[PDB]
Design a protein around this nucleic acid. Structure first.
Lengths: 120, 347
RNA sequence: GAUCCUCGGCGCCAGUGAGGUCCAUUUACUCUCGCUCUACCUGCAAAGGUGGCGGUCGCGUGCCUCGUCUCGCGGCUGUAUAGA
């Protein structure tokens, strides 16, 4: 069910790096429930999930509402890599990252979901 | 002294105790220390070959005072490393702090609070109590432990720092957390010599552990199973070897422990695969072959010994596994405890 | 087909997002292995007096070597790697 699977040749790495930079700019909603709140409230600019979920059904619900809100989603293959990409000390299973009016981070979100649009 | 040791005859020992969480190790030849997330810094004892268990410990206190340098901590320590003489013990952690004090009765006298996130790595200079303390505010500070005074801060870390190794000269090899960069400190002239990786079946997300074999080259371990030697002479890697602890759609398991023998060619690298993995530097001193495989749980930290006498035949080395990883509990396993697998290499 | 109020009885109650539990210095819990004194006993168990192997001082010194090694009696009290 991971048909937007991100490729380990550095697209995963740019995803997790932009996760970390958004974590340092506090633009980051972590975990599946808070990701779901950000997508349902429409604050979300991009959303990554983790395909290393042991039952992946517990994150399969957010591609629905991301298709409804028309925000790009993409899966990285490790919730541990996403977890310390956030800086959490636990495994983050699905992360959402928003934006503001003016930031270089918002530019990096723009180019990043341009690459996600090249996937989907 | 790689092939002058017999890996196939290793005499191991699996000691465990109650706290279940153990994080690091500190040798004081021979006296071994540990640090457990229950809050313990244990002085335990091993010496005689032809077995001893432990003597004493200290507790991290939930003590609501402010700028207090006494015996009270605030929170559990993370890593510990002990002096070459045997006259100072120092630790630091997510109580945002160090303490340094007498190693015999183990009563904390100085709590250094100059760092401001968490003290995530610690090393010495050999033969001198010049201390290097590297911390989660992505900095590395250097201490004059002769006065227990503060010396200098250093900067250049792109990301939250992760580990330091240092030797008898005023120099360091640090690692940043995710930035794929080992960072070679010229301490007196406060310069730095940046060695970045970018291994190119995962690519290098983070770069976990570091070890200096000598004053000319070193080795770093990344979380994609890439183990890399680096010459100080050259910006490129001296060697990169891939999938250092097997796979687990599967992914290479990352290196969680690396420590080498100084002025030697013996590389000690472990993971959550359960098997310790000893490497050697090759005869060309440029490449790397397999001196081989040699328990349960996910190995956080690892130590060193030697026979050290006129003979110098047969090492001793403990792995200090634990159930989780060392700073955060991103991965949990039922296997391992607060343990110590002392395996001794004969000949 | 009246609706609501009053008086009864019977039930019953939004957000956020990374912190949180114990408290001088202990030794988790279970299974196996090894068990540093022995004997006579005042002795039913269990505790004390004494003897073999001791072990330490004082002394006689034995010694084809007058040191080390074969020993003994007189004040005392047991201790080996010791736990895997």
């Amino acid at each position: 069910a991971a048909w937007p699977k991100a490729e380990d040749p550095a697209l995963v790495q740019e995803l997790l790096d932009c996760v970390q930079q958004a974590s340092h700019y506090r633009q980051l909603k972590k975990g599946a429930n808070e990701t779901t709140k950000s997508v349902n409230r429409g604050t979300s600019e991009l959303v990554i999930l983790a395909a290393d979920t042991q039952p992946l059904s517990i994150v399969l619900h957010i591609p629905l509402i991301c298709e409804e809100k028309n925000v790009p989603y993409v899966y990285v293959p490790s919730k541990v890599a996403l977890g310390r990409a956030c800086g959490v000390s636990r495994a983050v299973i699905a992360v959402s990252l928003t934006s503001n009016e003016a930031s270089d981070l918002n530019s990096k979100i723009r180019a990043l979901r341009d690459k996600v649009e090249r996937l989907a | 002294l790689a092939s002058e040791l017999a890996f196939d005859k290793a005499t191991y020992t699996q000691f465990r105790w109650n706290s279940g969480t153990v994080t690091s190790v500190a040798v004081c030849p021979p006296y071994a220390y540990t640090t457990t997330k229950d809050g313990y810094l244990t002085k335990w004892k091993l010496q005689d070959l032809p077995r001893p268990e432990r003597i004493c410990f200290a507790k991290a206190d939930a003590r609501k005072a402010n700028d207090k340098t006494y015996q009270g901590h605030l929170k559990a320590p993370l890593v510990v490393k002990a002096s070459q003489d045997g006259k100072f013990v120092v630790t630091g952690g997510a109580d945002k702090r160090l303490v340094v004090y007498n190693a015999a009765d183990l009563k904390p006298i100085k709590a250094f609070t100059q760092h401001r996130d968490a003290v995530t790595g610690l090393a010495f200079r050999r033969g001198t109590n010049q201390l290097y303390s590297c911390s989660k505010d992505r900095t590395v500070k250097v201490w004059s432990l002769d006065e227990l005074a503060y010396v200098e801060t250093l900067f250049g870390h792109q990301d939250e720092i992760l580990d330091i190794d240092a030797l008898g000269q005023e120099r360091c090899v640090s690692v940043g957390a995710r930035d794929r960069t080992a960072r070679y400190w010229k301490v007196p002239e406060e310069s730095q010599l940046v060695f970045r990786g970018g291994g190119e079946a995962a690519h290098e997300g983070s770069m976990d552990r570091v070890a200096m074999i000598d004053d000319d080259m070193f080795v770093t371990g990344s979380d994609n199973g890439d183990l890399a030697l680096w010459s100080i002479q050259r910006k490129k890697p001296l060697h990169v070897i891939a999938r250092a602890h097997g796979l687990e759609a599967p992914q290479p398991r990352g290196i969680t422990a690396l420590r080498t023998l100084p002025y030697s060619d013996l590389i000690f690298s472990g993971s959550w695969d359960g098997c310790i993995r000893v490497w050697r530097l090759s005869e060309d001193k440029r490449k790397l072959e397999a001196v081989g495989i040699l328990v349960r749980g996910i190995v956080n930290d690892i130590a060193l010994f030697e026979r050290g006498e006129r003979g110098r035949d047969g090492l001793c080395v403990v792995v200090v596994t634990g159930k989780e990883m060392r700073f955060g509990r991103w991965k949990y396993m039922k296997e391992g405890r607060c343990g110590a697998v002392i395996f001794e290499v004969p000949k």
